[PDB]
Amino acid sequence: MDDIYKAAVEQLTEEQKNEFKAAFDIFVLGAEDGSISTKELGKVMRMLGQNPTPEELQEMIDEVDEDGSGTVDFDEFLVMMVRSMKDDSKGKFKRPTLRRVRISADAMMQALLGARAKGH
Template sequence: TTTGKSRRELSEVHGFSEEQIAVFEESFSLLDKDGDGNISNYEIRSLMHSLGYSPSEEDISTVISKVDTDGNGSVDFDEFLTMMRCRR
C-alpha cells in the first residue's frame, strides 16, 4: 500500500475490510494525479468539479484540515481512509 502498512493493518485500524481497502487504494491512485502519495488541494478541487461541485478554497481547506494529521496541507492514504470512515 502507499503507507507501508499492510491491508490487514489498515483494515484493523480503520474498520474496513481488506477488499474495501483495495478499492480505496485504487480510488486514491486515481485522485493522486502526480503520484506523490498525497492528494493535494488542486487534486481535491479537480475531483469535486468532476462530480459537479464548485467548492471554494476555504471549503477544500476545511475538508483537508479535518483529516490532515501531519499538517502538510494534503491528504495521504492513511488520512484518506480516515476521511472515508467519517463519511460512512
C-alpha cells in the same frame, strides 16, 4: 485524525481500504506529492458537479490530514472516506467541512474509479 474512524479503517476490510486506495490513486493522478492536495481534492469535486475552493478543500483536507500539511494521503483518505460511512454522512464528533463542500463517499467513488466503484 479521529482514531474512531481509524478504527473504522480497522473496520474497513483490506478490500474496502483498497477501494479507497484505488480512489486515492485517481484522486492524486498527476499529483506531485502523491497525496491529495486541495487542487487534487477539488479535482473530483469538479468531476462531481461542484467547484470547490482550495480554501474549502483545505479544511476538508485538514480534517483527515494528520500533520496539517495540506495534503491527504491514503490512511488520512481512509479516515476521510470511512468518516462518511460511520453513518449516512455523520454529524458531530466530526468537523462540518465548513458547510459548502463535503465529500459524498459513494458518489465521489463514481467520479474517480469508473466501474471499480461497483462492488460494495
